[PDB]
Design a protein around this ligand. Sequence first.
Ligand SMILES: *[C@@H]1O[C@H](CO[C@@H]2O[C@@H](C)[C@@H](O)[C@@H](O)[C@@H]2O)[C@@H](O)[C@H](O)[C@H]1NC(C)=O
Ligand SMILES: *[C@@H]1O[C@H](CO)[C@@H](O)[C@H](O)[C@H]1NC(C)=O
Ligand SMILES: *[C@@H]1O[C@H](CO)[C@@H](O)[C@H](O)[C@H]1NC(C)=O
Ligand code: NA
Length: 227
Amino acid sequence: SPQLRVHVGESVLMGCVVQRTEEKHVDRVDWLFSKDKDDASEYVLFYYSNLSVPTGRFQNRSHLVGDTFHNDGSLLLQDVQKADEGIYTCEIRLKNESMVMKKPVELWVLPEEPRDLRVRVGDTTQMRCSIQSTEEKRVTKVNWMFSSGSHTEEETVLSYDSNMRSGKFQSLGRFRNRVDLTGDISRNDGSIKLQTVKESDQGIYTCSIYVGKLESRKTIVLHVVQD
Ligand SMILES: *[C@@H]1O[C@H](CO[C@@H]2O[C@@H](C)[C@@H](O)[C@@H](O)[C@@H]2O)[C@@H](O)[C@H](O)[C@H]1NC(C)=O
Ligand SMILES: *[C@@H]1O[C@H](CO)[C@@H](O)[C@H](O)[C@H]1NC(C)=O
Ligand SMILES: *[C@@H]1O[C@H](CO)[C@@H](O)[C@H](O)[C@H]1NC(C)=O
Ligand code: NA
């Protein structure tokens, strides 16, 4: 059973894909949460008759992102909190099948990442953004934006869209020639590298990382210091 660790605030995609040679529709998916067994459980989401229903304290953070016409009942849980630590069980039945697959996934939650990233002038840094996932190729779009304290508007640092022939755009303004993707988008990683950091690079970097139309958002405050 997969054991996934995430920091507080992160998203996690828990795969629930039924291995078949044929592309079958999903009839039923249930995702249930228990802290230990705990003697207690709660629904994250259920799906029947072509409708998903995120429930309870997961109602606004949870999404069936699997292709329900291709054997897939995978879940995206956003904004993970410490109370989300425990076991997620997927029960899934495909159209025209009687058998039910049951797949437990354990989620471990580490303390939230610091908001601030400290860098010295002239150094290189990474800004990391990725979704924790058992499944490849789920991220469809990554967009990095920048604002300083004095900006009237965000500017684009780097953008990648998997559903365009275009693919990858890099800044032609303040970050020109100093930014590139270090993440493998096919492995759900939108991380970038920023080279020869300047004082004027100080500010808020935002990553919007998409699984379909569903955005997960990450903020990094770049604090540029001396010596
Ligand atoms: C839907 O499924 C039918 C096959 O069911 C299979 O055989 C039975 C005896 C069970 O043991 C089970 O494990 C199998 O799934 C097909 O014969 C039928 O054509 C299918 N329905 C249609 C026409 O779409
Ligand atoms: C679910 O949607 C599919 C694809 O449009 C359709 O073929 C099927 O009949 C639907 N199932 C039910 C029972 O609503
Ligand atoms: C629930 O609230 C979140 C957090 O603000 C928001 O992004 C989302 O639109 C809501 N959920 C859905 C899918 O309606
Ligand atoms: Na269905």
